[PDB]
Amino acid sequence: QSMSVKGRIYSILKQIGSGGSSKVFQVLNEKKQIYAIKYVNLEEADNQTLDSYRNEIAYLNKLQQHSDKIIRLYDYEITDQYIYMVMECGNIDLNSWLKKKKSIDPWERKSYWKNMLEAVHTIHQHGIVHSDLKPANFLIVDGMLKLIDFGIANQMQGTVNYMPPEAIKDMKISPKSDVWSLGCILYYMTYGKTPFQQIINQISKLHAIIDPNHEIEFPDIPEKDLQDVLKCCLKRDPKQRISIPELLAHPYVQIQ
Numbered sequence: 189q190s191m192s193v194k195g196r197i198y199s200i201l202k203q204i205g206s207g208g209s210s211k212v213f214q215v216l217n218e219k220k221q222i223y224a225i226k227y228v229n230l231e232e233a234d235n236q237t238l239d240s241y242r243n244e245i246a247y248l249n250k251l252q253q254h255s256d257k258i259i260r261l262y263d264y265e266i267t268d269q270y271i272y273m274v275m276e277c278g279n280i281d282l283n284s285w286l287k288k289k290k291s292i293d294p295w296e297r298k299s300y301w302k303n304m305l306e307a308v309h310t311i312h313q314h315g316i317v318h319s320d321l322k323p324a325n326f327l328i329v330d331g332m333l334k335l336i337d338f339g340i341a342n343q344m345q346g347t348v349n350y351m352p353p354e355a356i357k358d359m360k361i362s363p364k365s366d367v368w369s370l371g372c373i374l375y376y377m378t379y380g381k382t383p384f385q386q387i388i389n390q391i392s393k394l395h396a397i398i399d400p401n402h403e404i405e406f407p408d409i410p411e412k413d414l415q416d417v418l419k420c421c422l423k424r425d426p427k428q429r430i431s432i433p434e435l436l437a438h439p440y441v442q443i444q
């Protein structure tokens with residue numbers, strides 16, 4: 189097939205993602221340059237839902253200038269019936285990639301970590317807290333990890349393993365809540381499992397996330413700095429939890 193976005197024609201090479209209201213296509217332009225078009229159908233969307241999309245688009249727009257750790261959005265076309273967004277094409281999402289590889293290089297993990305931190309930090313500067321970080325929110329774009337969404341818009345092909353105790357306790361959120369979710373991801377690339385994956389019952393799991401008494405397992409590893417970063421990220425009390433700016437000045441992110 190084919191599609192037009194602001195007079196520019198793109199040919200559909202493959203469909204990258206499936207969403208209830210959206211699809212992601214791998215496409216090529218007239219110049220034969222690859223791009224990803226997120227198509228969102230607006231035929232049956234509530235006004236509240238519409239506002240969220242407008243917020244996530246506006247966010248992708250301003251940040252562009254601030255950082256390259258956020259996926260580049262080249263162009264967009266919005267109508268009552270649909271939303272078309274011209275973005276850069278990544279090799280793969282971080283979740284799909286993680287499942288594929290049994291073991292991850294220490295150097296790669298350090299590079300991906302510094303990229304995640306730098307991107308999340310940018311969103312925080314503007315006052316945005318994702319509160320829903322998971323690997324799928326990340327995308328490998330030629331050795332660089334980029335942030336796809338701020339979580340306002342619907343995710344595509346959910347988990348509870350990356351949820352911070354303060355989210356569940358409120359039932360508040362702070363940039364420190366994003367640190368918890370990131371620490372889980374890092375903990376996953378260091379131990380191959382999320383801190384609470386071992387609990388079957390999702391109710392018991394939420395209890396495990398919020399129980400001070402429950403103690404997270406931190407097995408001995410060659411990288412002491414790496415071990416230190418995890419321990420510092422997964423402190424149940426956010427006031428006692430490390431910050432992104434501090435994490436950027438850590439030995440692990442700066443010393444190999």
Ligand SMILES: COc1ccc(Nc2ncc3ccnc(-c4cnn(C)c4)c3n2)c(OC)c1
Nearest residue numbers: 204205212224276277278279280281284344345
């Ligand atoms: C799982 O396989 C892929 C995931 C992502 C990509 N690339 C890519 N590039 C830009 C994107 C922009 C927005 N959303 C996605 C996305 C979200 N979920 N999935 C799934 C892809 C993008 N994926 C891919 O390319 C060939 C394959």
